[PDB]
Amino acid sequence: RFLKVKNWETDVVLTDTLHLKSTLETGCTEHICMGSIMLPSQHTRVATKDQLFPLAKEFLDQYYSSIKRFGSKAHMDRLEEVNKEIESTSTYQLKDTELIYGAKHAWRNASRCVGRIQWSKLQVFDARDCTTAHGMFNYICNHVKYATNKGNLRSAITIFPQRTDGKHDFRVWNSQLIRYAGYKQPDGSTLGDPANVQFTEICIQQGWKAPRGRFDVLPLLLQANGNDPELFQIPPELVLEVPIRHPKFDWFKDLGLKWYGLPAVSNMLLEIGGLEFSACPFSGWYMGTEIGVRDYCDNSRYNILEEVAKKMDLDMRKTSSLWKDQALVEINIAVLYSFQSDKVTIVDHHSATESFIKHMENEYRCRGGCPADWVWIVPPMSGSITPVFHQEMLNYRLTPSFEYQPDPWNTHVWK
Amino acid sequence: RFLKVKNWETDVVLTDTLHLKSTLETGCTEHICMGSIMLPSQHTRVATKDQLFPLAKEFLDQYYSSIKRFGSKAHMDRLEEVNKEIESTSTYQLKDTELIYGAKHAWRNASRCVGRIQWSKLQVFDARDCTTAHGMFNYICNHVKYATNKGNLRSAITIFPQRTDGKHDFRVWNSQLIRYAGYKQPDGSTLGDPANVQFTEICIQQGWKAPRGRFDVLPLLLQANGNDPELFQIPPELVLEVPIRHPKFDWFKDLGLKWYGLPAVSNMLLEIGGLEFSACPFSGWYMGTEIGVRDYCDNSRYNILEEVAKKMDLDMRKTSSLWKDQALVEINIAVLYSFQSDKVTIVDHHSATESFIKHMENEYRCRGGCPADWVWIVPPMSGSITPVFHQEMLNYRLTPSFEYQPDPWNTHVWK
Numbered sequence: 070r071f072l073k074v075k076n077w078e079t080d081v082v083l084t085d086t087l088h089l090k091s092t093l094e095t096g097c098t099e100h101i102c103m104g105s106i107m108l109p110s111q112h113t114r115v116a117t118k119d120q121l122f123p124l125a126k127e128f129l130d131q132y133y134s135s136i137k138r139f140g141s142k143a144h145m146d147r148l149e150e151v152n153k154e155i156e157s158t159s160t161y162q163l164k165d166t167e168l169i170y171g172a173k174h175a176w177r178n179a180s181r182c183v184g185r186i187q188w189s190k191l192q193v194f195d196a197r198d199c200t201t202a203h204g205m206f207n208y209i210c211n212h213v214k215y216a217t218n219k220g221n222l223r224s225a226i227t228i229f230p231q232r233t234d235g236k237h238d239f240r241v242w243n244s245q246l247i248r249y250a251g252y253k254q255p256d257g258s259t260l261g262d263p264a265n266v267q268f269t270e271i272c273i274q275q276g277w278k279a280p281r282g283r284f285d286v287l288p289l290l291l292q293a294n295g296n297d298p299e300l301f302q303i304p305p306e307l308v309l310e311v312p313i314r315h316p317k318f319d320w321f322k323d324l325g326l327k328w329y330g331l332p333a334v335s336n337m338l339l340e341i342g343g344l345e346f347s348a349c350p351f352s353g354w355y356m357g358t359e360i361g362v363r364d365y366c367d368n369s370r371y372n373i374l375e376e377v378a379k380k381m382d383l384d385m386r387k388t389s390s391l392w393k394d395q396a397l398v399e400i401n402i403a404v405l406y407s408f409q410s411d412k413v414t415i416v417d418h419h420s421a422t423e424s425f426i427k428h429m430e431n432e433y434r435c436r437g438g439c440p441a442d443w444v445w446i447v448p449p450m451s452g453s454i455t456p457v458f459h460q461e462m463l464n465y466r467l468t469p470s471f472e473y474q475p476d477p478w479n480t481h482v483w484k
Numbered sequence: 485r486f487l488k489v490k491n492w493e494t495d496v497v498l499t500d501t502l503h504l505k506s507t508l509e510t511g512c513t514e515h516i517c518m519g520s521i522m523l524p525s526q527h528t529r530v531a532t533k534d535q536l537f538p539l540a541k542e543f544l545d546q547y548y549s550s551i552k553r554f555g556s557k558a559h560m561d562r563l564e565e566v567n568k569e570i571e572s573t574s575t576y577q578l579k580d581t582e583l584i585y586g587a588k589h590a591w592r593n594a595s596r597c598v599g600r601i602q603w604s605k606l607q608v609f610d611a612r613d614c615t616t617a618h619g620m621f622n623y624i625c626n627h628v629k630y631a632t633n634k635g636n637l638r639s640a641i642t643i644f645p646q647r648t649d650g651k652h653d654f655r656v657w658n659s660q661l662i663r664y665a666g667y668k669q670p671d672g673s674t675l676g677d678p679a680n681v682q683f684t685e686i687c688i689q690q691g692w693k694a695p696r697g698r699f700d701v702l703p704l705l706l707q708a709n710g711n712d713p714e715l716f717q718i719p720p721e722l723v724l725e726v727p728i729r730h731p732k733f734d735w736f737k738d739l740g741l742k743w744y745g746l747p748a749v750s751n752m753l754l755e756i757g758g759l760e761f762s763a764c765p766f767s768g769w770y771m772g773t774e775i776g777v778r779d780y781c782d783n784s785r786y787n788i789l790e791e792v793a794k795k796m797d798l799d800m801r802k803t804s805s806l807w808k809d810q811a812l813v814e815i816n817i818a819v820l821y822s823f824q825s826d827k828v829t830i831v832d833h834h835s836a837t838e839s840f841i842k843h844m845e846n847e848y849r850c851r852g853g854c855p856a857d858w859v860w861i862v863p864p865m866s867g868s869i870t871p872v873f874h875q876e877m878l879n880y881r882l883t884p885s886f887e888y889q890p891d892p893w894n895t896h897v898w899k
């Protein structure tokens with residue numbers, strides 16, 4: 070029952086008992102593994118009252134077990150108190166402290182996150198008093214400014230009010246708070262970021278006047294209490310950006326690339342004690358590969374491996390001349406060097422995967438486990454030269470959690 | 485029931501119905517995914533008579549469905565014929581054709597194999613008449629010579645006689661037919677290949693006179709009909725080797741590395757219709773990364789990233805100077821270039837992963853699926869610049885299959 074996971078670079082073995090507290094399902098069966106499906110039928114988020122108290126109870130029982138006073142009268146009475154309020158309102162409200170705990174443990178439990186060694190150092194911004202798209206914008210700018218901290222980035226999350234009936238739903242329609250624009254071309258090609266081309270046209274549908282260039286920071290599309298969303302543009306001074314130069318190649322400035330400092334995922338659902346927070350944007354700092362490998366070199370993204378290999382003077386005819394590999398390392402050396410010479414917080418994929426193994430160690434000791442998705446933990450380049458490649462990982466689903474959810478423009482009763 | 489898998493670089497979708505014919509279990513449950521455990525409790529191989537005919541029946545039913553004459557009298561009578569022989573002997577014997585089919589489909593079903601586009605072009609060598617360690621040696625040399633084909637490598641498998649009672653068990657004790665020796669040092673370090681140090685000392689235990697150097701090709705340790713194994717050394721002329729030079733760096737010869745042409749896994753079990761072939765060595769050709777990334781650069785293997793970065797003139801102080809990445813591409817450019825200038829069959833990780841996606845396509849059309857292990861299919865460097873990174877894959881276990889098995893020196897009743 071109490072399963073073993075081994076490291077095959079160090080022969081270290083740890084025991085996972087944490088997977089017994091696990092509740093949610095994975096998509097795998099005894100006869101089929103889905104560990105490489107992207108948005109499994111489980112990982113995406115209408116829930117009634119009768120189901121709510123067991124979820125409320127289970128969360129409150131682990132939160133009081135956390136502050137060491139499990140079973141005390143404060144536990145017993147808060148149990149009865151929430152019970153009573155779920156009778157009355159068929160929902161309930163989290164204590165300020167229960168929100169910080171749940172938020173921090175949703176991140177802690179995110180099995181696809183390699184940065185979780187920092188899970189407790191998270192700044193929780195309670196925006197459950199917010200009532201308008203403008204109030205959302207104001208909270209979001211205060212988050213951007215705070216988390217950016219003049220390049221010395223800090224982890225944070227802003228939590229807008231919980232879903233209630235369903236038709237009243239706070240949603241940031243952006244996938245990340247800071248994203249570059251995507252414009253298709255008259256010749257069928259694409260300027261900027263091809264991922265966002267669909268969203269970029271929704272923004273222009275709602276009145277965005279596009280500057281039709283490369284790295285055009287998109288505006289926010291904020292939906293408040295189930296209403297129709299509204300465009301707001303983050304003050305340019307609040308969006309920090311890093312221009313990408315190389316420490317050897319003085320032709321790398323001519324490439325003219327740049328990336329924003331702050332990764333801030335905004336389209337996810339935060340679940341705490343059965344309550345569903347439909348808008349909860351959260352930020353940390355970048356691992357280099359997310360920009361240098363995936364962002365710049367994905368085929369359906371910026372796809373610069375073409376030009377980078379050109380200026381490098383590379384054998385670009387043969388597939389097996391590994392020109393793609395060679396230009397990929399130079400690109401990620403440049404993202405790192407640029408962010409670091411500007412005191413903008415960035416982590417390389419070696420340092421971050423070592424931290425996770427270190428993190429994993431503490432989790433198996435003082436918690437009995439650490440759910441981890443190998444498919445996602447392993448960096449997208451130089452896999453087996455980083456220690457996580459050789460680390461077996463048990464994946465399983467614990468709550469509080471971050472879940473995917475449908476994009477709003479497919480579900481919103483428009484007008 | 486009939487699950488979808490998507491590509492997120494091309495938006496291609498395929499439907500998997502093949503997973504319905506699946507029989508064996510994976511290790512995952514509805515509440516836990518094991519897709520990154522290395523030797524799962526299932527993937528490793530004493531079986532009685534009553535269980536044998538359903539397995540014999542199921543295999544014969546798909547083999548006759550293969551030659552288009554499913555349900556014919558040849559099918560009906562071969563069914564009765566094997567049934568009768570499993571009454572009489574409580575085992576049975578495969579037709580020469582049933583052995584070629586089962587062997588080819590064991591490979592076809594190997595979900596961790598990226599090379600399976602070639603699954604039908606496999607040369608089956610029937611060594612079920614073999615009775616001695618010398619006969620095993622003779623079959624194995626004929627395999628080495630054939631599969632090597634003067635550098636124009638060809639896929640093959642030699643199948644020694646099936647397990648019967650259990651205590652009579654043909655086993656190649658080597659993990660691969662051609663492997664370099666592993667010697668620990670007086671200072672605690674290691675010369676040669678650290679993986680094999682345990683096996684290298686068993687060979688010297690049984691009389692191997694070690695030339696205590698780097699790339700010393702080990703000798704075979706062959707156990708015949710459950711007997712004690714015996715050392716034989718493959719004629720040096722039959723072991724083809726590639727010295728590793730770089731197409732730019734004339735200091736790369738000075739590194740003095742070399743690798744053997746023929747990957748030939750020998751320690752696995754071949755299962756066909758409930759019959760267990762405990763010795764079945766099989767070979768193809770190398771994907772570059774297996775040598776350049778894993779073999780040369782694994783920490784517990786040859787670990788050359790050290791010296792390669794030195795001669796390259798590299799920033800080796802900082803972790804984030806990606807010196808490890810940079811030297812890893814040069815190393816794999818050199819393995820490829822060396823093998824190719826010698827007409828020794830090698831495939832680069834881009835060409836081989838494109839072939840697999842192409843392969844996957846045909847499998848989902850003319851078979852309804854293709855079991856695949858993402859954790860193993862993705863090359864161990866430059867993950868997301870190869871198309872398999874973006875390909876969802878359903879893993880599941882179909883038979884005929886290759887299974888792991890215990891090493892013999894832990895299970896053999898010695899004398």
Ligand code: HEM
Pocket residue numbers: 112176179180181182183184185187191224225226351352353354355356359416421445471
């Ligand atoms: C502090 C520095 C952080 C680093 C270095 C980091 C790193 C990463 C990376 C590289 C990924 C993979 C994303 C991708 O490749 O598309 C990821 C995923 C993720 N991270 Fe972290 N992250 C950090 C902070 C955070 C924070 C503050 C949260 C939440 C409060 C978080 C929760 C998550 C979640 C929910 C996922 C995705 C799981 C999924 O897709 O199902 N991370 N992280």
Ligand code: HEM
Pocket residue numbers: 527591594595596597598599600602606639640641766767768769770771774831836860886
């Ligand atoms: C023809 C050229 C071939 C190529 C390019 C190729 C490539 C590969 C590679 C790179 C691996 C991963 C091994 C590792 O990383 O440790 C692998 C695994 C494997 N291959 Fe292939 N291979 C070839 C031929 C074959 C043949 C002839 C067979 C069997 C008849 C086979 C069956 C397997 C099996 C059983 C595994 C391992 C599955 C496991 O570990 O459970 N392959 N192959």
Ligand SMILES: CNCCc1cc(F)c(F)c(OCc2cc(C)cc(N)n2)c1
Pocket residue numbers: 184332333334337351352353354355356359
């Ligand atoms: C299909 N691709 C989905 C991309 C994706 C999905 C998520 F659900 C994430 F959470 C995520 O996070 C990226 C990230 C976030 C933070 C806070 C720090 C950091 N370094 N990286 C990225």
Ligand SMILES: CNCCc1cc(F)c(F)c(OCc2cc(C)cc(N)n2)c1
Pocket residue numbers: 599747748749752766767768769770771774
């Ligand atoms: C813990 N590591 C286990 C290593 C391992 C285990 C297996 F079960 C394999 F089958 C294998 O095959 C490597 C290989 C074989 C062939 C025929 C061609 C090729 N290119 N590569 C390697």
Ligand SMILES: C[C@H](O)[C@H](O)[C@H]1CNc2nc(N)[nH]c(=O)c2N1
Pocket residue numbers: 105106107444445446492873874875876877
């Ligand atoms: C097909 C596969 O599920 C998909 O490409 C995944 C693989 N692993 C990943 N890992 C990370 N960190 N980010 C990703 O977007 C993905 N994509």
Ligand SMILES: C[C@H](O)[C@H](O)[C@H]1CNc2nc(N)[nH]c(=O)c2N1
Pocket residue numbers: 077458459460461462520521522859860861
């Ligand atoms: C921990 C993990 O299961 C282990 O390192 C696996 C990962 N994927 C692999 N993939 C291949 N091709 N070969 C391997 O040896 C491994 N090792």
Ligand SMILES: [Zn+2]
Pocket residue numbers: 097101102103104512516517518519
């Ligand atoms: Zn699984």
